[PDB]
């Protein structure tokens, strides 16, 4: 019962990974495919440890552990893209960890990810994160008020909104979140009467 | 092999079973024709099964809608009754609409009523709306709430963003695994 | 082998049994067809069983709802009766809604009534609401209470945060174990 | 080989099946003639199937339209009822029109109602409109929304661009693949 | 060899088939006499077929026209009903006219209604018109729109160029090729 | 009747632990799984001492004993994460216990946890706990009033609230609680008319 | 008919104790379990003296005897926790008993508890009891007025109360009571109109 | 089952491509043809890896990867036209990459496109992009207000609009988008009352 044949006809929707922990992993790109694969494991059978991977769920799982063991660590989001070598965005300006400490950190992350062979920790500039957030926001001709504070920035959008600008606002926000994540830049859409 | 419930309709039977499975209890649905459905459980689980029937107020009651108490079969009618009938239909129709929005699994809608404004020589009051919604797990609820609110705002003669309340969440971890039989 | 209760309906039978099991008493549910259900207990427990039937006012009475006393079968109606009927339906509908919120196992809702404001040439009074709720054990009740209150606030023509009261708690340790038989 | 639903009409049967397939569950549609349709599933999936029936409020209810509560069969009529009947028809007719626009797969339309303006010696209120729409995936929604809004603006006696709300999106990834059978 | 739809009328049957073919699905139309038409599909396509039936709200509903709710069979009539009946006919007649213009394949027309101007002692409101149109592909839509608008302007007692809206487009690439059978 | 086979199909939902007290423990990450396992023990059978573990229930059990034997001890929350070596957050600034005393404390905690092999007591800075509480709170653009007092801090949120900010407020609070616990920082959401 | 098998399936809910008076005791942690065990003794059988133990009932039984033989003794609450060696909290500041007198006292308490092997009498500081009562009370942002008097302190809570603060108030009070008991600190919640 | 015969009668609607990854690709010029081909793959069969190509979907797929690995890269749109050698429009003025760096970039793009033999990266002048946007816009006699900002330009169109100018506006915008894409020039049609 080869797992590849157990999964749907369009086998290219899933990336099967062979974890060093003897668990065969199923990387899915969407929660509909996540559920699909989970139903396969519960419905059919495969005599071997197995577990479905979901980019957001894994990002969260890691962030939980990470907060406990490395509290106050300033970071953005893990980009899984190529399962084998996920990229860890780390705040360049807020973290003062030494190279050796960063080595250790990546090793702990490798422990958290049975499939990943290595972790590419890289430092990102907080300014460029904020710059992109605001630039795109004003490109869309949206009204807003920026809130700089220690440790982050919030973009407040208030007042009555036109259905067109509402659509535009959400599209922008979702994309920003998908890329950078919501740990530094926080958006605040508030539909109110004037 | 214990009898738990009898004479259930189709909806009730499936709902009760869902709960029992969620709490790790296998259940049998027996079709007795005109006599309805019966639910039976393994004796080892029976005690727990009873506990949960109590806990969740099972079997479920039929859904209550306002129009059910002001039927068109009446020989006569009144402004009061007719206005109530209309509002009942409107709530239902709004629920039908919200459940077609992307990511919405379930939604409920309430609208305030006016039973005696004009009756007392008074002008009508502002309309209040409230709604509940369940989304597909992982969905960005904090932003989606604004579509609901905007939609409802222009869906009725005179409402505003301070008199529309939306409370929502998302589904739980799907029960995709069978409870299993007792050991014996 | 003692007879405790006879002629019980399905709901009553299961409720009484739940209580007896909770207090470590085994009970038999006997289906006598058209004659209803009967509950019997072991003679060793019989004394205690009787005590608890008394203590918990068993078997349970049917649930009382306002509309049950102002039926549509009447040949005539009155403003008083019609307004009461409507409010009854509304309370029921609100209960149906609260029980779908995440973590809620059970909930009850009350709304104040107005039987003679306009009758006496007076303006209507502010609406008062109250509600009870039972949550899944371990749930953060101290925060959840604010959803209920907000939801209800815009669910009716004219209420406010000082005239809405919510009293709530969470379920007890589930009785997942059988009482056991007497020693003999 | 488990029975899930029975007595379904044609629409309901096909809708439920669509959902089950979407969640990787095979389902059989059985034609029992005058008794309606029945849906059965493989025992391995049965638990999950039940879960989803609950989750999606299945089987579907019939669509609610305002005119259904103010039928022409009545021996008498009232201004209130007649005006309501008209508006109901108008909403339906507007839905029929929007669904013929290029790229639109589905659309719903609501119009505000007026039940007692003239009744109270008052002038009529401005008309509010709202609508939902689903487009063919890849379509430029951000611009298409302006056609809907312009069309509706001159489709009724007195509306404006601030009292017309449109909420829309596009279809999901089409389920073009069969779920597959259980392994055994 | 799966049953998809049953009891279809002629129009519905042909419409559903058109959609399935457009999405590369072969379909059989079966004439069962008095029982209507049935649509069946190859098992390989069945999953996709179901998906599309859902997506496009199939089978189609009957077309809604205002006069259908104010029939001449009534023993009595009212100014309200009669005026509505007239407008319904007028919209239909205008649609019949636009569809005869060169290059027009399909067109729909709406006219605003007046249900209680005179009723309230008020003068009548300006008439609003809106229309949809589909043209033969390659046609100069940007200029053709002016004929429609001019025609409609003098087709009614009191309209103007600011209260007439026309939204239009042209047909898609004609599906002139058969879907083909499954590979087996 | 191996316990692993007695528990659900997705065996990876539970972590079976072998306590030194001859009791086989079932660590569950959610009250739904807690109940699942408890039903297994009551429904089926297994000839051996057994007991289901729940992170919050255990945190509470310990805190009860701990208050009786070590009254006035200033601490936050036990992070079970890796069953074998749970982490005990202790107030760095409020406690003045000696290293030897802390040794003894950890030994008592080991006695309380039959499965745990050792306890990692670590000292946390009260300031950073408070700092995070307020920082996130204001990042969400929420109105509040801080209440510093000896032994703790309370964040009061009053007035009428927008449904959007209500949602945001709860999400934040739940996460803070989950991490640090409610022994130092207390939140007070009060929905009131203005 | 071994008592352990006579009691419920989850035998870990009860602690069977072997008293020196030849009575087999059943320690229960909750009145529901207390009743459970009592029903077992009345329903089934066991040829031997037996008696169900309840922490609060025993605390009360002792306090009755104690008041008669040691009137004016200032004390708080007995912490049974580990049956064998219960802890007796005694007011450090109000009692002036000699070490020898305290020895005798513990011996009398041992007589009152057939199962207990010894009694650990310890002296508590009245100030810290009061300090905790007030600190937690004000942490919850509750309104109150303290009433110091010879021999105790009362915390008066009057006025109209918000349902939220009502819940919080009770939770706090119940916990304080559970730990220290109500012999020194008395709370007085009075829901009244303003 | 040659794929060419599996696809529709008018075989000239599709361009079958032989990827170096052993996947046979189907290039479609329209989402209706995209779906057509996908249904063929699901309905019929072909014993070989296969995947339908869609110009917009591929443009998006690439842009996702590209943003992660080359963040801040200023570019416009990939012109697939002749599958074998797609053209990559790159901002001439905003990018300062060296020739060698651009070589590497094209190589990464080649990796992303299994069928493409090479990638023709070319630099476009931002001024001419903006110039065309405005020129056509005003040629159509449309009212607008230009918004120059760092990194882009937005063309705001407000007020009540005549059905004729609405049609014209959309036609223009769609064409501009199709050619240049919406990463530099953003249009904002807002139908409002005056």
PDB file of N, CA and C in Angstrom, chain C residues 29-87:
ATOM      1  N   UNK C  29     -34.096  -0.385  33.397  1.00  0.00           N
ATOM      2  CA  UNK C  29     -35.158   0.288  32.661  1.00  0.00           C
ATOM      3  C   UNK C  29     -35.962  -0.751  31.911  1.00  0.00           C
ATOM      4  N   UNK C  30     -37.227  -0.884  32.267  1.00  0.00           N
ATOM      5  CA  UNK C  30     -38.069  -1.885  31.654  1.00  0.00           C
ATOM      6  C   UNK C  30     -39.095  -1.287  30.725  1.00  0.00           C
ATOM      7  N   UNK C  31     -39.051  -1.720  29.478  1.00  0.00           N
ATOM      8  CA  UNK C  31     -39.975  -1.268  28.451  1.00  0.00           C
ATOM      9  C   UNK C  31     -41.252  -2.097  28.456  1.00  0.00           C
ATOM     10  N   UNK C  32     -42.354  -1.500  28.906  1.00  0.00           N
ATOM     11  CA  UNK C  32     -43.637  -2.194  28.951  1.00  0.00           C
ATOM     12  C   UNK C  32     -44.571  -1.732  27.828  1.00  0.00           C
ATOM     13  N   UNK C  33     -43.987  -1.269  26.727  1.00  0.00           N
ATOM     14  CA  UNK C  33     -44.749  -0.852  25.565  1.00  0.00           C
ATOM     15  C   UNK C  33     -45.573   0.379  25.851  1.00  0.00           C
ATOM     16  N   UNK C  34     -46.861   0.292  25.529  1.00  0.00           N
ATOM     17  CA  UNK C  34     -47.808   1.384  25.722  1.00  0.00           C
ATOM     18  C   UNK C  34     -47.946   1.830  27.168  1.00  0.00           C
ATOM     19  N   UNK C  35     -47.501   1.004  28.107  1.00  0.00           N
ATOM     20  CA  UNK C  35     -47.624   1.352  29.501  1.00  0.00           C
ATOM     21  C   UNK C  35     -46.446   2.182  30.003  1.00  0.00           C
ATOM     22  N   UNK C  36     -45.452   2.428  29.148  1.00  0.00           N
ATOM     23  CA  UNK C  36     -44.322   3.268  29.529  1.00  0.00           C
ATOM     24  C   UNK C  36     -43.158   2.485  30.108  1.00  0.00           C
ATOM     25  N   UNK C  37     -42.275   3.196  30.797  1.00  0.00           N
ATOM     26  CA  UNK C  37     -41.105   2.577  31.382  1.00  0.00           C
ATOM     27  C   UNK C  37     -41.217   2.393  32.878  1.00  0.00           C
ATOM     28  N   UNK C  38     -40.559   1.360  33.364  1.00  0.00           N
ATOM     29  CA  UNK C  38     -40.523   1.105  34.784  1.00  0.00           C
ATOM     30  C   UNK C  38     -39.100   1.000  35.266  1.00  0.00           C
ATOM     31  N   UNK C  39     -38.849   1.505  36.459  1.00  0.00           N
ATOM     32  CA  UNK C  39     -37.516   1.440  37.023  1.00  0.00           C
ATOM     33  C   UNK C  39     -37.491   0.574  38.247  1.00  0.00           C
ATOM     34  N   UNK C  40     -36.593  -0.412  38.237  1.00  0.00           N
ATOM     35  CA  UNK C  40     -36.461  -1.303  39.378  1.00  0.00           C
ATOM     36  C   UNK C  40     -35.038  -1.315  39.896  1.00  0.00           C
ATOM     37  N   UNK C  41     -34.898  -1.607  41.185  1.00  0.00           N
ATOM     38  CA  UNK C  41     -33.586  -1.616  41.823  1.00  0.00           C
ATOM     39  C   UNK C  41     -33.380  -2.814  42.722  1.00  0.00           C
ATOM     40  N   UNK C  42     -32.121  -3.082  43.044  1.00  0.00           N
ATOM     41  CA  UNK C  42     -31.795  -4.162  43.953  1.00  0.00           C
ATOM     42  C   UNK C  42     -32.292  -3.813  45.337  1.00  0.00           C
ATOM     43  N   UNK C  43     -32.826  -4.804  46.036  1.00  0.00           N
ATOM     44  CA  UNK C  43     -33.361  -4.608  47.373  1.00  0.00           C
ATOM     45  C   UNK C  43     -32.394  -3.926  48.358  1.00  0.00           C
ATOM     46  N   UNK C  44     -31.085  -4.247  48.352  1.00  0.00           N
ATOM     47  CA  UNK C  44     -30.054  -3.606  49.169  1.00  0.00           C
ATOM     48  C   UNK C  44     -29.967  -2.094  48.963  1.00  0.00           C
ATOM     49  N   UNK C  45     -30.282  -1.621  47.767  1.00  0.00           N
ATOM     50  CA  UNK C  45     -30.200  -0.204  47.457  1.00  0.00           C
ATOM     51  C   UNK C  45     -31.525   0.498  47.598  1.00  0.00           C
ATOM     52  N   UNK C  46     -32.612  -0.258  47.487  1.00  0.00           N
ATOM     53  CA  UNK C  46     -33.968   0.274  47.530  1.00  0.00           C
ATOM     54  C   UNK C  46     -34.217   1.395  48.531  1.00  0.00           C
ATOM     55  N   UNK C  47     -33.721   1.268  49.758  1.00  0.00           N
ATOM     56  CA  UNK C  47     -33.940   2.313  50.753  1.00  0.00           C
ATOM     57  C   UNK C  47     -33.316   3.624  50.320  1.00  0.00           C
ATOM     58  N   UNK C  48     -32.068   3.550  49.884  1.00  0.00           N
ATOM     59  CA  UNK C  48     -31.350   4.716  49.425  1.00  0.00           C
ATOM     60  C   UNK C  48     -31.995   5.286  48.183  1.00  0.00           C
ATOM     61  N   UNK C  49     -32.433   4.406  47.287  1.00  0.00           N
ATOM     62  CA  UNK C  49     -33.059   4.829  46.051  1.00  0.00           C
ATOM     63  C   UNK C  49     -34.263   5.696  46.343  1.00  0.00           C
ATOM     64  N   UNK C  50     -35.108   5.250  47.274  1.00  0.00           N
ATOM     65  CA  UNK C  50     -36.282   6.014  47.664  1.00  0.00           C
ATOM     66  C   UNK C  50     -35.903   7.369  48.189  1.00  0.00           C
ATOM     67  N   UNK C  51     -34.903   7.402  49.056  1.00  0.00           N
ATOM     68  CA  UNK C  51     -34.433   8.653  49.606  1.00  0.00           C
ATOM     69  C   UNK C  51     -34.081   9.653  48.519  1.00  0.00           C
ATOM     70  N   UNK C  52     -33.348   9.201  47.503  1.00  0.00           N
ATOM     71  CA  UNK C  52     -32.936  10.094  46.431  1.00  0.00           C
ATOM     72  C   UNK C  52     -34.090  10.514  45.522  1.00  0.00           C
ATOM     73  N   UNK C  53     -35.086   9.645  45.320  1.00  0.00           N
ATOM     74  CA  UNK C  53     -36.258  10.034  44.532  1.00  0.00           C
ATOM     75  C   UNK C  53     -36.944  11.217  45.186  1.00  0.00           C
ATOM     76  N   UNK C  54     -37.029  11.166  46.505  1.00  0.00           N
ATOM     77  CA  UNK C  54     -37.579  12.267  47.260  1.00  0.00           C
ATOM     78  C   UNK C  54     -36.722  13.511  47.121  1.00  0.00           C
ATOM     79  N   UNK C  55     -35.439  13.370  47.437  1.00  0.00           N
ATOM     80  CA  UNK C  55     -34.485  14.471  47.417  1.00  0.00           C
ATOM     81  C   UNK C  55     -34.476  15.268  46.130  1.00  0.00           C
ATOM     82  N   UNK C  56     -34.498  14.579  44.999  1.00  0.00           N
ATOM     83  CA  UNK C  56     -34.443  15.256  43.718  1.00  0.00           C
ATOM     84  C   UNK C  56     -35.773  15.464  43.026  1.00  0.00           C
ATOM     85  N   UNK C  57     -36.888  15.401  43.755  1.00  0.00           N
ATOM     86  CA  UNK C  57     -38.196  15.638  43.141  1.00  0.00           C
ATOM     87  C   UNK C  57     -38.419  14.793  41.887  1.00  0.00           C
ATOM     88  N   UNK C  58     -38.167  13.496  41.968  1.00  0.00           N
ATOM     89  CA  UNK C  58     -38.305  12.651  40.798  1.00  0.00           C
ATOM     90  C   UNK C  58     -39.614  11.875  40.784  1.00  0.00           C
ATOM     91  N   UNK C  59     -40.111  11.539  39.594  1.00  0.00           N
ATOM     92  CA  UNK C  59     -39.630  11.826  38.252  1.00  0.00           C
ATOM     93  C   UNK C  59     -39.897  13.287  37.887  1.00  0.00           C
ATOM     94  N   UNK C  60     -39.110  13.863  36.978  1.00  0.00           N
ATOM     95  CA  UNK C  60     -39.141  15.236  36.490  1.00  0.00           C
ATOM     96  C   UNK C  60     -40.471  15.651  35.887  1.00  0.00           C
ATOM     97  N   UNK C  61     -40.810  16.916  36.055  1.00  0.00           N
ATOM     98  CA  UNK C  61     -42.004  17.474  35.444  1.00  0.00           C
ATOM     99  C   UNK C  61     -41.635  17.917  34.039  1.00  0.00           C
ATOM    100  N   UNK C  62     -42.611  18.129  33.160  1.00  0.00           N
ATOM    101  CA  UNK C  62     -42.452  18.635  31.809  1.00  0.00           C
ATOM    102  C   UNK C  62     -42.076  20.106  31.870  1.00  0.00           C
ATOM    103  N   UNK C  63     -41.318  20.562  30.885  1.00  0.00           N
ATOM    104  CA  UNK C  63     -40.835  21.934  30.869  1.00  0.00           C
ATOM    105  C   UNK C  63     -41.936  22.936  30.577  1.00  0.00           C
ATOM    106  N   UNK C  64     -41.966  24.001  31.375  1.00  0.00           N
ATOM    107  CA  UNK C  64     -42.974  25.045  31.255  1.00  0.00           C
ATOM    108  C   UNK C  64     -42.522  26.219  30.424  1.00  0.00           C
ATOM    109  N   UNK C  65     -43.323  26.528  29.415  1.00  0.00           N
ATOM    110  CA  UNK C  65     -43.086  27.631  28.505  1.00  0.00           C
ATOM    111  C   UNK C  65     -44.352  28.467  28.437  1.00  0.00           C
ATOM    112  N   UNK C  66     -44.206  29.779  28.334  1.00  0.00           N
ATOM    113  CA  UNK C  66     -45.349  30.682  28.418  1.00  0.00           C
ATOM    114  C   UNK C  66     -46.427  30.447  27.380  1.00  0.00           C
ATOM    115  N   UNK C  67     -46.031  30.198  26.134  1.00  0.00           N
ATOM    116  CA  UNK C  67     -46.986  29.981  25.051  1.00  0.00           C
ATOM    117  C   UNK C  67     -47.920  28.810  25.287  1.00  0.00           C
ATOM    118  N   UNK C  68     -47.578  27.911  26.200  1.00  0.00           N
ATOM    119  CA  UNK C  68     -48.405  26.755  26.453  1.00  0.00           C
ATOM    120  C   UNK C  68     -49.741  27.144  27.076  1.00  0.00           C
ATOM    121  N   UNK C  69     -49.826  28.353  27.633  1.00  0.00           N
ATOM    122  CA  UNK C  69     -51.059  28.803  28.245  1.00  0.00           C
ATOM    123  C   UNK C  69     -51.838  29.808  27.417  1.00  0.00           C
ATOM    124  N   UNK C  70     -51.425  30.042  26.183  1.00  0.00           N
ATOM    125  CA  UNK C  70     -52.155  30.959  25.321  1.00  0.00           C
ATOM    126  C   UNK C  70     -52.144  30.416  23.914  1.00  0.00           C
ATOM    127  N   UNK C  71     -52.809  29.277  23.682  1.00  0.00           N
ATOM    128  CA  UNK C  71     -52.838  28.488  22.457  1.00  0.00           C
ATOM    129  C   UNK C  71     -53.580  29.157  21.312  1.00  0.00           C
ATOM    130  N   UNK C  72     -53.123  28.849  20.095  1.00  0.00           N
ATOM    131  CA  UNK C  72     -53.690  29.390  18.860  1.00  0.00           C
ATOM    132  C   UNK C  72     -55.034  28.771  18.534  1.00  0.00           C
ATOM    133  N   UNK C  73     -55.388  27.710  19.245  1.00  0.00           N
ATOM    134  CA  UNK C  73     -56.655  27.044  19.055  1.00  0.00           C
ATOM    135  C   UNK C  73     -57.835  27.889  19.522  1.00  0.00           C
ATOM    136  N   UNK C  74     -57.577  28.947  20.297  1.00  0.00           N
ATOM    137  CA  UNK C  74     -58.663  29.800  20.735  1.00  0.00           C
ATOM    138  C   UNK C  74     -59.331  30.479  19.561  1.00  0.00           C
ATOM    139  N   UNK C  75     -60.649  30.574  19.641  1.00  0.00           N
ATOM    140  CA  UNK C  75     -61.459  31.181  18.596  1.00  0.00           C
ATOM    141  C   UNK C  75     -61.215  32.679  18.484  1.00  0.00           C
ATOM    142  N   UNK C  76     -60.810  33.284  19.591  1.00  0.00           N
ATOM    143  CA  UNK C  76     -60.543  34.706  19.648  1.00  0.00           C
ATOM    144  C   UNK C  76     -59.190  34.940  20.279  1.00  0.00           C
ATOM    145  N   UNK C  77     -58.677  36.150  20.144  1.00  0.00           N
ATOM    146  CA  UNK C  77     -57.392  36.486  20.730  1.00  0.00           C
ATOM    147  C   UNK C  77     -57.421  37.893  21.264  1.00  0.00           C
ATOM    148  N   UNK C  78     -56.376  38.258  21.975  1.00  0.00           N
ATOM    149  CA  UNK C  78     -56.270  39.588  22.528  1.00  0.00           C
ATOM    150  C   UNK C  78     -54.836  40.008  22.422  1.00  0.00           C
ATOM    151  N   UNK C  79     -54.558  41.305  22.369  1.00  0.00           N
ATOM    152  CA  UNK C  79     -53.250  41.920  22.326  1.00  0.00           C
ATOM    153  C   UNK C  79     -52.370  41.358  23.414  1.00  0.00           C
ATOM    154  N   UNK C  80     -52.953  41.172  24.586  1.00  0.00           N
ATOM    155  CA  UNK C  80     -52.247  40.628  25.718  1.00  0.00           C
ATOM    156  C   UNK C  80     -51.732  39.247  25.411  1.00  0.00           C
ATOM    157  N   UNK C  81     -52.623  38.384  24.935  1.00  0.00           N
ATOM    158  CA  UNK C  81     -52.243  37.021  24.624  1.00  0.00           C
ATOM    159  C   UNK C  81     -51.234  36.951  23.501  1.00  0.00           C
ATOM    160  N   UNK C  82     -51.446  37.733  22.452  1.00  0.00           N
ATOM    161  CA  UNK C  82     -50.568  37.684  21.299  1.00  0.00           C
ATOM    162  C   UNK C  82     -49.165  38.143  21.621  1.00  0.00           C
ATOM    163  N   UNK C  83     -49.041  39.208  22.407  1.00  0.00           N
ATOM    164  CA  UNK C  83     -47.726  39.697  22.761  1.00  0.00           C
ATOM    165  C   UNK C  83     -47.005  38.666  23.610  1.00  0.00           C
ATOM    166  N   UNK C  84     -47.731  38.006  24.517  1.00  0.00           N
ATOM    167  CA  UNK C  84     -47.140  36.963  25.343  1.00  0.00           C
ATOM    168  C   UNK C  84     -46.631  35.814  24.494  1.00  0.00           C
ATOM    169  N   UNK C  85     -47.427  35.394  23.514  1.00  0.00           N
ATOM    170  CA  UNK C  85     -47.033  34.309  22.629  1.00  0.00           C
ATOM    171  C   UNK C  85     -45.739  34.610  21.923  1.00  0.00           C
ATOM    172  N   UNK C  86     -45.613  35.828  21.423  1.00  0.00           N
ATOM    173  CA  UNK C  86     -44.404  36.219  20.738  1.00  0.00           C
ATOM    174  C   UNK C  86     -43.184  36.133  21.625  1.00  0.00           C
ATOM    175  N   UNK C  87     -43.268  36.703  22.825  1.00  0.00           N
ATOM    176  CA  UNK C  87     -42.127  36.678  23.724  1.00  0.00           C
ATOM    177  C   UNK C  87     -41.706  35.279  24.075  1.00  0.00           C
TER     178      UNK C  87
END
